[PDB]
């Protein structure tokens, strides 16, 4: 019963930086992640615009920036929702391990960017259709998937169409992508077969 | 390993739903076949996982249907299976026209069954051939 309009208003005014509360969580960690988190956002954004422009026909594409930023605003809003949630579920305030994991932040961000770019599909060479974002970030399908269900429970403002799109990406990971030879899954299966 | 169990759990639900969809339209005459096929299907994902490598879930699915029918003498042509599959909303022709064989070689889903599938599973598929009832694998709950 959600409309595209509300999430659009939320992201439009949301901040590009971690909130006071999110930093609160960064400072509660055995190892402080605020540093790697900011730097990662800086570099990926640099890589993302160049790639976007390249995939999009050719030249200079002022639209790549506007999207990445919306991605980041969602990324942070979702990370803080997940943390608040975990805190009331396990009653601990640390989380150092989760928040220092490169893959976790890599997956959250991608997922968040996949949603933002989805809404603006009706906006050559080829662009974003779901798998694209993976290659752009050098992120495996099996890792992305690990972030999907939580992302859906952390963001109460997702449309029906957006959850639907997220599920379709998940089904494609499960049907083949997570089974490619480059997939961490086979190690996860071997590690378990012993 | 939450990651690995979440993954399998969901891959089973998806797989079963698609299997149940095809079996209800293709094998209504023999309602018993679905549970045996699902058993072979699950056995594969769980124990012959190398078979999925660079391959598609639906290719193993249609190959299990075609298999058990064979040992139970139920007449089910692959051409009939393909046509139905095409009706599923996510279905892409390429999934049964271009399937991996050895290294970089692709051919129809038939060459796959006969050249790779049947061989890796021949031994096991035989169990079900025994005129004795099998240890059917548990169906994915999937309520709600």
């Amino acid at each position: 019963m959600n409309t595209i309009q509300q999430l659009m208003m939320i992201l439009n005014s949301a901040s590009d930086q971690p909130s006071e509360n999110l930093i609160s969580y960064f400072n509660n960690c055995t190892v402080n992640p605020k540093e790697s988190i900011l730097k990662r956002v800086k570099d990926i954004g640099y890589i993302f615009k160049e790639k976007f422009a390249k995939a999009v026909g050719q030249g200079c594409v002022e639209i790549g920036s506007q999207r990445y930023k919306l991605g980041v605003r969602l990324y942070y809003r979702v990370m803080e929702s997940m943390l608040k949630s975990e805190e009331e579920r396990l009653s601990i305030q640390n989380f150092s391990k989760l928040l220092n994991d490169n893959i976790f932040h890599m997956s959250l961000l991608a997922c968040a960017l996949e949603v933002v770019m989805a809404t603006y599909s009706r906006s050559s060479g080829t662009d974003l259709s779901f798998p694209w974002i993976l290659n752009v970030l050098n992120l495996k399908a099996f890792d992305f998937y690990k972030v999907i269900e939580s992302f859906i429970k952390a963001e109460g403002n997702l449309t029906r169409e957006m959850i639907k799109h997220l599920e379709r990406c998940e089904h494609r990971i499960m049907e083949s992508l997570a089974w490619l030879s480059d997939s961490p899954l086979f190690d996860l299966i071997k590690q378990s077969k012993d | 390993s939450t990651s690995l169990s979440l993954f399998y759990k969901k891959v089973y639900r998806l797989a079963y739903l698609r299997l149940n969809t095809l079996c209800e339209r293709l094998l209504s005459e023999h309602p018993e076949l679905e549970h045996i096929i699902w058993t072979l299907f699950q056995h594969t994902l769980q124990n012959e996982y190398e078979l999925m490598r660079d391959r598609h879930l639906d290719q193993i699915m249609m190959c299990s249907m075609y298999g058990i029918c064979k040992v139970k003498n139920i007449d089910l042509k692959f051409k009939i299976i393909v046509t139905a599959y095409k009706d599923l909303p996510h279905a892409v022709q390429e999934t049964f026209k271009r399937v991996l064989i050895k290294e970089e070689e692709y051919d129809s889903i038939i060459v796959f069954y006969n050249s790779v599938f049947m061989q890796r599973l021949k031994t096991n598929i035989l169990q079900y051939a025994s005129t004795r009832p099998p240890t059917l694998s548990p169906i994915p709950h999937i309520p709600r």
Partner: peptide, 18 residues
């Protein structure tokens, strides 16, 4: 709804990377 949530109450995003 109509989406399959496979996580159980005793499970959370933190166990997925744990």
């Amino acid at each position: 709804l109509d989406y399959h949530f496979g996580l159980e109450e005793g499970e959370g995003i933190r166990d997925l990377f744990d």
